[PDB]
Amino acid sequence: PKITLLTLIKTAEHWARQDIRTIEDSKLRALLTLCAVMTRKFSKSQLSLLCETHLRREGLGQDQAEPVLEVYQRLHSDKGGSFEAALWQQWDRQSLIMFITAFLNIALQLPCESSAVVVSGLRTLVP
Amino acid sequence: PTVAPPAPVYR
């Protein structure tokens, strides 16, 4: 199947509603890519809001904002999956699972652009 | 390749 924008979102919808703690590593690795690709569909301005929401929902302290925002920033600017590969190599499986699930559940509810002019205009078009 | 940041600590 073609990885269109719609397919990408439907794939995210689907995996957001799964318990991924027992899935094989090959699929977990692919989910990391999904999070990376999906992160890049947010404007740069929305990454702090992504971080703040991640912290709030996961019950993390403000001292965790630096590393969490860094993950989102470095995925957003990732070239050739270099940073993505580093996360896979250097984090334990439990950390990856928790970050991935957290992201997939927040990503579909946050706006992907921040300009009021963009948001207000697009709302007039929604059925 | 690079050096990843630390994973989030739950507490």
Author numbering:
A (entry chain A): 140 to 266
B (entry chain F): 602 to 612
Sentences from the paper on this structure:
Viral protein 30 (VP30) proteins are present in all filoviruses and perform several important functions, but homologues are lacking in other negative-sense RNA viruses. Additionally, VP30 binds RNA in the presence of zinc and associates with the viral RNA synthesis machinery, which includes nucleoprotein (NP), VP35, and large (L) protein that contains the enzymatic activities. EBOV VP30 (eVP30) is critical for viral transcription (mRNA synthesis), because it is required for initiation at EBOV NP (eNP), the first gene of the seven gene genome. eVP30 has also been implicated in regulation of co-transcriptional editing of viral glycoprotein mRNAs and in modulation of viral transcription reinitiation. We demonstrate that eVP30 binds directly to eNP.
We generated protein crystals for structure determination using the purified eVP30110–272/eNP600–739 complex. Initial low-resolution diffracting crystals were optimized by in situ proteolysis and resulted in several well-diffracting crystals. Residues from eNP that span 600–612 are highly conserved not only across all ebolavirus genus members but also marburgvirus as well. Although PPXP motifs typically form a left-handed turn, in the eNP/eVP30 complex structures, the conformation of this motif does not form the expected polyproline type II helix. Although the binding pocket is somewhat shallow, the interaction site displays a shape complementarity (Sc) score of 0.6, which is considered significant. Analysis of the interface reveals that there are seven hydrogen bonds between eVP30 and eNP and a number of hydrophobic contacts, which make up much of the observed total of 1,923 Å2 buried surface area. For example, eVP30 Q203A or R213A or Q229A did not result in loss of binding to eNP WT in the FPA, whereas eVP30 E197A and W230A resulted in a near complete loss of binding. However, our data show that the binding site identified in our structure, which includes residues such as W230, results in complete loss of binding and corresponding loss of activity in viral RNA synthesis.
